[PDB]
Amino acid sequence: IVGGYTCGANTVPYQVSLNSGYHFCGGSLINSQWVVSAAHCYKSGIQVRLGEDNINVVEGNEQFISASKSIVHPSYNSNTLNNDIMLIKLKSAASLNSRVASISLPTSCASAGTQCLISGWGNTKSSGTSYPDVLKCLKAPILSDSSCKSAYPGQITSNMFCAGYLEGGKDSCQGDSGGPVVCSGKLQGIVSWGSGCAQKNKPGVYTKVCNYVSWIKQTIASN
Ligand SMILES: NC(=[NH2+])c1cc2c(I)cccc2s1
Ligand SMILES: [Ca+2]
Incomplete structure (x- = not known):
């Protein structure tokens, strides 16, 4: 930014960091088990990190959950970026609280x-x-x-x-x-x-x- x-x-509180060994894209929590992000952020092996503020320091309010599956929009065109949206399901449902909300x-x-x-x-x-x-x-x-x-x-x-x-x-x-x-x-x-x-x-x-x-x-x- x-x-x-x-x-x-x-x-x-709904902001997410997608990490594949480092932070590469942001995302939004829409409910305890699902996140929406951009299709161009598609990667195999994603870990979703919730309750983050400083991404290089564990401050105590984080939840790190692996994705069980990713769905890129059926009509995503990587050449024009038309329909640049993807859904990520979590392996476990996140614990929503004041720091983690959808x-x-x-x-x-x-x-x-x-x-x-x-x-x-x-x-x-x-x-x-x-x-x-x-x-x-x-x-x-x-x-x-x-x-x-x-x-x-x-x-x-x-x-x-x-x-x-x-x-x-x-x-x-x-x-x-x-x-x-x-x-x-x-x-x-x-x-x-x-x-x-x-x-x-x-x-x-x-x-x-x-x-x-x-x-x-x-x-x-x-x-
Ligand atoms: N101008 C912009 N808001 C953006 C520029 C970029 C670039 I450059 C790479 C990936 C995503 C974005 S959003
Ligand atoms: Ca942190």
Whole structure:
């Protein structure tokens, strides 16, 4: 996250870190046994870490659970990143408490202008590499599809939306992939892609979760 701030330990209780020997993507806990993240974060051998704040230090509120299975969306296209969402089932059901909570799925899509909260342990420099050990947060509004489409002509589908600042400066970045974009208490997006980080006229692009709620609900009830 570039131009964001330290969240504070366990203030984003639904945030997850996917680890395959190191942190590689973020994710969201939607219920005791399931996590949603980005399909481009797909890896075999994932361990989900809940109640994290500093990922290099065991502070006492963590739960490390291995995934029993991963389901990438049936129509995910790794070339355009269209339908960049994946569900991960845990081997054991997590113990929810004040530091580990699930986020709710949306009932409808959000409007351009709605302010959202984006969080993750990704890179914090636009030009450079600086990886934080504590969670970073960023408040950013959803942008209109027109400004999203003009920034990225022929690359935006109806399953993607942009959020951020066209002037640059604040944005999600690599290492944040799979993480949550929560607006009004609902998980509305997943960190998917962008052209560099915090660049001017290059906002972040997020998976539009409101379009996958039936697929998520149907898939988790059958697995
Ligand atoms: N501009 C952005 N918000 C992003 C940039 C990236 C990059 I570069 C890699 C992976 C994910 C993301 S999100
Ligand atoms: Ca830790």
